[PDB]
Amino acid sequence: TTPSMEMYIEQIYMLIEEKGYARVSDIAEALAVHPSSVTKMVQKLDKDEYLIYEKYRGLVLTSKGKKIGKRLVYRHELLEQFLRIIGVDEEKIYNDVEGIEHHLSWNSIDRIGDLVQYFEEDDARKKDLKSIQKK
Amino acid sequence: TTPSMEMYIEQIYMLIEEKGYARVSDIAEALAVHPSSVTKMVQKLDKDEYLIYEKYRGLVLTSKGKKIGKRLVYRHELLEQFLRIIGVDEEKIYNDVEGIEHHLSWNSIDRIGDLVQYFEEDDARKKDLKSIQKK
Ligand SMILES: [Mn+2]
Ligand SMILES: [Mn+2]
C-alpha cells in the first residue's frame, strides 16, 4: 500500500461502518477532492484486491480490505487518544494525527498502545505526568 | 518554513557542525535527492535569507537559519529519545522520526518532552512500562 491508499481505505471503511455503503461523492466530500480522483484510486484499490464493485451495494471491501481498514481506523484513534493522554490541545490533535499516521511503523503503533495502556490503568500516572507539564 | 525547507536546514545545520561546510554533494547524498534539486532549493533558501555565501566557507546558515536549525535538531533528537524510551525497535526509530518530525505541531513536541522526562526521573516507571510490553 501507500499513504494515499491507506487514507482512502480508512475513509471508505468509516463510511461503510457509518452508512452501510461508500459512495464516490461521500468519499470525495470527506477528502475534499474531485470524484474523478476518487474513481481513479478506487480502480487501483479494485486492481489490488482491497475492494470490488457490487451491482447494488456499490463499493464493498474484500476480506483483505476490511481487515486492514479496521486497523487503519484503530491506528488513527489510538494516536488521537495518545496525544490527548499526554495533554496536547484538542484543536491540534486531528491535524497532528493525519500528518503522522502514515509515517509511523506498526512497531511504533504497538509500543504507543502499551504506553496508552500504561496511563489507562493508573490515574496517579496521568497525575504525575500532568504535574510535569504545568510545572 | 515548510517541511521540505526544514528537511534541508536540518541537514545543512548538521553538515556545518560536523564538517564546517555544507556542500551540495553532501546535501544531496544525505537527503536522497539529486544535486540538481539541491541547487534549486539552496538558491531559494539563499534568496529567502536562510542561507548566505561566505568567503572560503561557501554556503552557510544565516542567523535566521542557524536559530531554526538548532530547533530542528533538538526536535529530531527528542523524538529519537521518545521512541527509544517507549521500546521501539532500535532499527525502526530513525525512519519513524524522519517521517513524523516535520508534521507534528510544537505543542505535541513539547508534550512528548514532558513524557520523556517523566520516564527519565524514575527507572521504576520504565520497568512498569516494559512489563506491559512483556505481556
Ligand atoms: Mn486517519
Ligand atoms: Mn531529522
UniProtKB/Swiss-Prot annotation, chains A, B:
PANTHER family, A to Z: IRON (METAL) DEPENDENT REPRESSOR, DTXR FAMILY, TRANSCRIPTIONAL REGULATOR MNTR
Subunit structure: Homodimer.
Official protein name in the record: HTH-type transcriptional regulator MntR
Superkingdom, taxonomy of origin: Bacteria
Pfam families hit by this protein: Fe_dep_repr_C, Fe_dep_repress
Activity control mechanisms: DNA binding is strongly activated by Mn(2+) and Cd(2+), but it is poorly activated by non-cognate metal cations, including Co(2+), Fe(2+), Ni(2+), Ca(2+) and Zn(2+). In the strict absence of divalent transition metal ions, MntR has a low affinity for DNA.
Binding-site residues, Cd(2+) 1: 7, 98, 101-102
Entry's localization field: Cytoplasm
Comment on protein domains: Contains an N-terminal DNA-binding domain and a C-terminal dimerization domain. Contains two metal binding sites per subunit, site A (corresponding to metal ion 2) and site C (corresponding to metal ion 1), which both contribute to the metal selectivity of MntR. A large metal cation is needed at the A site to correctly orient and position the C site ligands. Smaller, non-cognate metal cations bind at the A site, but disrupt the C site, blocking the full activation of MntR. Binding at the C site also favors Mn(2+) and Cd(2+) over other metals.
Binding, Cd(2+) 2: 10, 76, 98, 101
Outcome of gene disruption: Null mutant is very sensitive to manganese. Mutant also displays increased sensitivity to cadmium.
Family of the protein in this entry: Belongs to the DtxR/MntR family.
Gene Ontology process terms (BP): intracellular manganese ion homeostasis
Chain's role: Central regulator of manganese homeostasis that regulates the expression of both manganese uptake and efflux systems. In the presence of high levels of manganese, it mediates repression of the manganese uptake systems MntH and MntABCD and activation of the efflux systems MneP and MneS. Binds with high affinity to the regulatory regions of its target genes. The manganese concentration required for activation of efflux is higher than that for repression of uptake.
Disulfide bonds: none
GO cellular component, one term: cytoplasm
GO molecular function per UniProt: DNA binding; DNA-binding transcription factor activity; manganese ion binding; protein dimerization activity
Organism: Bacillus subtilis (strain 168)
Chief localization: cytoplasm
UniProt keywords, alphabetically: Activator, Cadmium, Cytoplasm, DNA-binding, Manganese, Metal-binding, Repressor, Transcription, Transcription regulation
Binding locations of Mn(2+) 2: 10, 76, 98, 101
Domain HTH dtxR-type: 1-62
Residues annotated to bind Mn(2+) 1: 7, 98, 101-102
